[PDB]
Structures are given as structure tokens and as C-alpha cells.
């Protein structure tokens, strides 16, 4: 299998500005018949894939001229002259030269936005949940940019590692932001054994973490 | 034009041997091209599986050479993918495609079918309210331990959508769990009633949970 490496993983672009996705292969894609079978694939979330470019630089039927492809041997490049909203999604470089056919990891194309601080909300486990013997603390991190974020759970001033599960939204169609949900599930026996519960979020908007707490 | 539609079971138990169908219209699977199957894992990683040639010849990915097989029905204008002794790692969205040897690519894609593999039984969700202790106020709703997907989460029977953030389901022990938050004016809370509405049509369950101040 020839590995296909894309650069970068995520790409931030202001509407109307130029963007470039690079693809590098572990082996030359030039075939013995003198053709290079590298293709570019586009996909929106929830939507199915769609071929954008084939044979390095040949555009598909409905593809706008603002897209261009280039490269040879092991290095390939897709460029957008100016990015519209219709271009947002994930791009894949796919090779047909070697057996088997392989796809790149993908490059996420997102809208560039002004830096946003997360709105943190912490929630103690409900009385209804405690009646089942289970207990889960929920921490919401809403409306932040960029999506690079790290949450930390702290119990009586100590880091909790096991039992945490995280969920991320995609970028908002309205304000171009991200939101994150974090849950810590424990037993009623363990939850009632400790007093103070905190979630600490580390973002680029501040050098210091944003702490939200509650005592029992 | 040419279009492709995928069909088959949504849900399958491990160690089973299900089959997907690609129905093609606008072109005969017997005239020229190759006809492919591709799967997309969580993390959106794509893997080429194999193809059925217009001549009827087949070829598969070396990593799936024995575990899968591809067949076709010329009279119905359809081709099939046969999974065998399936596992939960086979959980993916399965796509069928037409391929050209001249362009060395897949030119047309279908709107795939999600095939989930799990042994978990149809269980309804527990719905839990989320309220704060001590400008804008954010309330929450926790739907815990349901299978299968989907779940419909609504706020005030469909009245609130402006501050609603509904999060993708995550897997607990063979069971799904999602969160939803809503941010509202403090003048409307707890002054007015805010209700989390949850539906799980798989188990045929509708739960309404009104949030109460702590």
C-alpha cells in the first residue's frame, strides 16, 4: 500500500482568499504507460464524496476554474484561487496507479474567524440519576474558536482520567464557531466521597485556564 | 445522467454475513466500466474494497481478499457486496462507485449506506435534567444509555433553536450517550418553563423532562 500524506490536517481560510492542499506519496505515481493517476476527492459532512480532479490536473464537469491541480512523481498540490462557502468540507488525494487503490487522510477546510473564548457551564449530576446509583458531571464549552482545546477534570484538586467522554460539534453555519461537551461518569458511592468538582479548559485566547466549579 | 443508490440492512450483529446492494440507473453495468465498493470508517478514513468489471471479472483489496466477495445481477442492473463473519470494526458507511481505467479514478459516487455492527439490545434512553448552582443562563439535558441511533432532541416541543447545541452521540459500554445545551435569558428562567424533548423511535419512546432550579 502506498501511503498518501496530506498537508495540513486542518486549514483556516477567510472567504475570498487563496488556499493550498499538498499531497505526498510514499511511491511515485507515474505509471509505465506514462500517465500519473492522482485524483482529488471532495466531501461535505453528512454528504457523499464527489470527484473534483483526476489525472493530476483535469477538472470534472461542474468544477469551477478557481480550482487547480499540479504535481508529478511523489508531490501533488490542489489550489483554490479564492475560497467560497461551497468549498467547505474535507479534501482527499486518491491514487489509482498502484494496487490497491488508496486515499489520503483528508484535509479539513474551515472558515477563519476571530478568536473566541469558550462559554463554560458546569452541571452536577441530577437527583434522578443518583437514584439509579450512577452519577455524571457535565461541562459545556460553547462558542469558541479555534477548535484546538483541552479539558481537564479535577476532583478535590486532583486530575481525573478514567470515565471521561468527550463530544465535539462541527463548525457552526451561523457564527462559524465550535462547541464541546464533556461528561465524567462515576458511581453514587464515588461521587458522594468528594466535595469540589471542577472542569479546566485550556485555549489560545488566554495563557491561564478557564475554571468552572461547584461544591456539594 | 448516471446515479447510484446503496441499500441493505442498517444494523447487523457480529459474526454475521450481510449483503449490500448497489442499484444503478442511467447506464448498463455491462457495457464498459468497473463497479466498485468503498467504505468510510469513523474518523472519515476511506478504504477501497474491490470491483466487478463489465466483463464480470472481479478483484479485491489484498487485506480483504478472502473475507469479502463481489457479485452482480445483469437482469436487475445491480451488483452486490458480501461481508463475511463480520465484526464491530466493520462499522462504516459503504459507498458504491463507477471507475474508469483511462482516468484511473472513480467518476460517480452514490449516497452511501451506514452499516453499524453491534450486539447490544434495543434499549430506551434515561433522560436527565441539568441545572446550575448559583446575564445568560445555560440549561442542559443528558440522554444516557440508548441503542440504536438516532435520537431526536428538541427544546420546548420545537420552539427553541437559537441557543441549542446538540452534540454527537458517544459510545459508553455498547450504549449511546448524547448531550444537549440551551442558553436563554435569565428573565425567562426560571420564570418560564423550559422542557427537554427526547424521542427514540427505535424503542418507541418519547420522554419530556422539564428542568427545575436546584
Amino acid at each position: 500500500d502506498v501511503v498518501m500524506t496530506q498537508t495540513p490536517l486542518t486549514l483556516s481560510v477567510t472567504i475570498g482568499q487563496p488556499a493550498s492542499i499538498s499531497c505526498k506519496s510514499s511511491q511515485s505515481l507515474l505509471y509505465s504507460d506514462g500517465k500519473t493517476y492522482l485524483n482529488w476527492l471532495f466531501q461535505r459532512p453528512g454528504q457523499s464524496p464527489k470527484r473534483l480532479i483526476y489525472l493530476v490536473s483535469k477538472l470534472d464537469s461542474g468544477v469551477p476554474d478557481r480550482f487547480t491541480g499540479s504535481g508529478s512523481g511523489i508531490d501533488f498540490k490542489l489550489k483554490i484561487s479564492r475560497v467560497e462557502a461551497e468549498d467547505l468540507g474535507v479534501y482527499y488525494c486518491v491514487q489509482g496507479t498502484h494496487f490497491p487503490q488508496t486515499f489520503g487522510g483528508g484535509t479539513k477546510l474551515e472558515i477563519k474567524r476571530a478568536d473566541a473564548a469558550p462559554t463554560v457551564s458546569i452541571f452536577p449530576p441530577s437527583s434522578e440519576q443518583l437514584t439509579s446509583g450512577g452519577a455524571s458531571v457535565v461541562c459545556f464549552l460553547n462558542n469558541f474558536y479555534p477548535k484546538d482545546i483541552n479539558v481537564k477534570w479535577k476532583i478535590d484538586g486532583s486530575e481525573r482520567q478514567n470515565g471521561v467522554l468527550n463530544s465535539w460539534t462541527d463548525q457552526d453555519s451561523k457564527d462559524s464557531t465550535y462547541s464541546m461537551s464533556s461528561t465524567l461518569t462515576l458511581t453514587k458511592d464515588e461521587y458522594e466521597r468528594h466535595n469540589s468538582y471542577t472542569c479546566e479548559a485550556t485555549h489560545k485566547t488566554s495563557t491561564s485556564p478557564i475554571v468552572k466549579s461547584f461544591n456539594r | 445522467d448516471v446515479q447510484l443508490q446503496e441499500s441493505g440492512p442498517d444494523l447487523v450483529k457480529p459474526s454475521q454475513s450481510p449483503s449490500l446492494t448497489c442499484t444503478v440507473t442511467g447506464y448498463s453495468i455491462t457495457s464498459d466500466y468497473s463497479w466498485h465498493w468503498i467504505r468510510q470508517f469513523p474518523g472519515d478514513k476511506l478504504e477501497w474494497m474491490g470491483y466487478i468489471h463489465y466483463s464480470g471479472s472481479t478483484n479485491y483489496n489484498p487485506s480483504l481478499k478472502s473475507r469479502i466477495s463481489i457479485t452482480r445481477d445483469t437482469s436487475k442492473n445491480q451488483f452486490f457486496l458480501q461481508l463475511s463473519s463480520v465484526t464491530i470494526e466493520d462499522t462504516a458507511t459503504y459507498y458504491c462507485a463507477r471507475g474508469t481505467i483511462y482516468e484511473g479514478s472513480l467518476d460517480y459516487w452514490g449516497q452511501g449506506t451506514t452499516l453499524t455492527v453491534s450486539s447490544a439490545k434495543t434499549t430506551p434512553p434515561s433522560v436527565y435534567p441539568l441545572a446550575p448552582g448559583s446575564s445568560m443562563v445555560t440549561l442542559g439535558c443528558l440522554v444516557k444509555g440508548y441503542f440504536p441511533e438516532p435520537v431526536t432532541v428538541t427544546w420546548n416541543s420545537g420552539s427553541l433553536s437559537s441557543g441549542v447545541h446538540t452534540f454527537p452521540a458517544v459510545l459508553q459500554s455498547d450504549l449511546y450517550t448524547l448531550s444537549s445545551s440551551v442558553t436563554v435569558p435569565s428573565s425567562t428562567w426560571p420564570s418560564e418553563t423550559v422542557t427537554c424533548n427526547v424521542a427514540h423511535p427505535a424503542s418507541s419512546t418519547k420522554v419530556d423532562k422539564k428542568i427545575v432550579p436546584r
Binding site: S32, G96, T97, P100 | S34, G99, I101
Partner: peptide, 8 residues
């Protein structure tokens, strides 16, 4: 084998 085992 390459291209033929991919589309041929």
C-alpha cells in the same frame, strides 16, 4: 500489478 488490478 497496478492500474489493471485497480480498474481492469
Amino acid at each position: 500489478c497496478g492500474l489493471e488490478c485497480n480498474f481492469g
